[PDB]
């Protein structure tokens, strides 16, 4: 980051004694059969394995093909379900997955509204909108999760749901 | 792996040397086109003359698998019995163990001390944060004798270890 790590992926739970070359051939074949490549040839350029800790990193030829490959999370390779993830250095650009939260009781303070949200996971941003003259809540807020996969989970768990005698609205801010 | 590069050879004739047997198998492999590079696939041979058997050791896993087709092959008038070692693992990593719920202050050798009360280990690693160098509270291992695995699971899984409860299961 901010622009680094855009063309690599973490692979965990790899099969025992598997070679770099065989893992490369496996992923290149799946990209092709699954229709995920965007040009003739092989998207995966190189594979590096850590034998002792049982994981790999893949290196891709393009930014968009790296992103498509994430669809393979869970794929079974020699009896093993593979865990596919972004590198830890990889971050989306700011505000990319911001949420609007509305329909909140306006007698609730910031920490009480945060406590509903952090039940799904840690936040990296949060604000509850207040009238500046009085400091009183307007009953709506914005947030952003550290992990971006938690976003769909909070939406599915909270949107349209009863809170008091109001139905909460939880959706993407743009 | 290691036992994935050996074969048992029985019914061996009296008087045969380790070098005569090494030459025979290298010659058979080349003749049947079963080698996957230039050179000789058999690195070493050890013979027990009192019990009429030998072990072969190969340079690769796939050449070892290939030589399995030599069961019944004639050497000095006699048919040889070719088999896998008794501790060969068809599905490797099957007995690798996950150890979770470890106190986060314990170092590698302290965790191994817990595990080697059941027997010697062939593999071990404690997972640490690369940034700080600090234990994440879990490890992996394999025993030299795979039959101890379940006796380690029975001994440790669910045991209170200070402030936390251990999970010991096959990593699978």
Curated annotation (Swiss-Prot), chain A:
It is found in: Nucleus. It comes from the Eukaryota. The modification Phosphoserine is found at residue 132. Residues 7-89, 97-174 form the RRM domain. The modification 5-hydroxylysine is found at residue 114. Coiled coil: none annotated. Interacts with U2AF1L4. Heterodimer with U2AF1. Binds unphosphorylated SF1. Interacts with SCAF11 and SNW1. Interacts with ZRSR2/U2AF1-RS2. Interacts with RBM17. Interacts with PRPF19; the interaction is direct. Interacts with POLR2A (via the C-terminal domain); recruits PRPF19 and the Prp19 complex to the pre-mRNA. Interacts with KHDC4 (Isoform 2). Interacts with ZRSR2. Interacts with the SF3B complex composed of SF3B1, SF3B2, SF3B3, SF3B4, SF3B5, SF3B6 and PHF5A. Plays a role in pre-mRNA splicing and 3'-end processing. By recruiting PRPF19 and the PRP19C/Prp19 complex/NTC/Nineteen complex to the RNA polymerase II C-terminal domain (CTD), and thereby pre-mRNA, may couple transcription to splicing. Induces cardiac troponin-T (TNNT2) pre-mRNA exon inclusion in muscle. Regulates the TNNT2 exon 5 inclusion through competition with MBNL1. Binds preferentially to a single-stranded structure within the polypyrimidine tract of TNNT2 intron 4 during spliceosome assembly. Belongs to the splicing factor SR family. It is linked to Developmental delay, dysmorphic facies, and brain anomalies: An autosomal dominant disorder characterized by global developmental delay with intellectual disability and speech delay, epilepsy, hypotonia, short stature, microcephaly, intermittent exotropia, and non-specific facial dysmorphism. Brain imaging shows a thin corpus callosum and/or delayed myelination. This is Splicing factor U2AF 65 kDa subunit. It comes from Homo sapiens (Human). The chain holds residues 148 to 336 of 475 of the full protein.
């Amino acid at each position: 980051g901010p622009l680094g790590s855009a063309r690599r992926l973490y692979v965990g739970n790899i099969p025992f004694g598997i070679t770099e070359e065989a893992m490369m051939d496996f992923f290149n074949a799946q990209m092709r059969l699954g229709g995920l490549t965007q040009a003739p040839g092989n998207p995966v350029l190189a594979v590096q394995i850590n034998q002792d800790k049982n994981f790999a990193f893949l290196e891709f030829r393009s930014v968009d093909e790296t992103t498509q490959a994430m669809a393979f999370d869970g794929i079974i390779f020699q009896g093993q379900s593979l865990k596919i993830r972004r590198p830890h250095d990889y971050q989306p650009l700011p505000g990319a997955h911001k949420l609007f939260i509305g329909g909140l009781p306006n007698y609730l303070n910031d920490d009480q509204v945060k406590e509903l949200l952090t039940s799904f996971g840690p936040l990296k941003a949060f604000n509850l909108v207040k009238d500046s003259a009085t400091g009183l809540s307007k009953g709506y807020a914005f947030c952003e999760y550290v992990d971006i996969n938690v976003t769909d989970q909070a939406i599915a768990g909270l949107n349209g749901m009863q809170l008091g005698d109001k139905k909460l609205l939880v959706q993407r801010a743009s």
